[PDB]
Ligand binder design. Sequence first.
Ligand SMILES: C=CCNC(=O)[C@H](Cc1ccc(O)cc1)NC(C)=O
Ligand SMILES: [Cl-]
Length: 130
Amino acid sequence: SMQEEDTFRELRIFLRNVTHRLAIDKRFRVFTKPVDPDEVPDYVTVIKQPMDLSSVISKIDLHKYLTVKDYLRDIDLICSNALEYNPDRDPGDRLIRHRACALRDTAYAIIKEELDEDFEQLCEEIQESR
Ligand SMILES: C=CCNC(=O)[C@H](Cc1ccc(O)cc1)NC(C)=O
Ligand SMILES: [Cl-]
């Protein structure tokens, strides 16, 4: 129905605003664009499902997220990919892990404060009806 289309459109506006706030944070610049295979040829071989915030915006605009849970699965991937690719004790790897955990924690904290639980439940119910 048009009302369900309206619901998904509101979800996309909400997710674009959360993603823009993460992308303009200086700590998260490394996560804003895909890893360049030139610098990092082993990346695409270790990480089977690369994810970054520009990919997330593209997904929003392709109507790939129909619930905030689906979006948070991709934010979790940005985090877990960085934990897996950069697991060493050296400071460059620790800095990327800390920035990835902080992204993820920031996204969840904005959603806890600003997503109405009944809106998420509505999205879940429309998704499940498809
Ligand atoms: C799970 C998300 C966060 N990751 C982190 O804790 C990172 C890196 C780290 C990870 C394990 C260590 O034993 C020591 C450092 N930042 C810190 C705590 O400086
Ligand atoms: Cl830096």
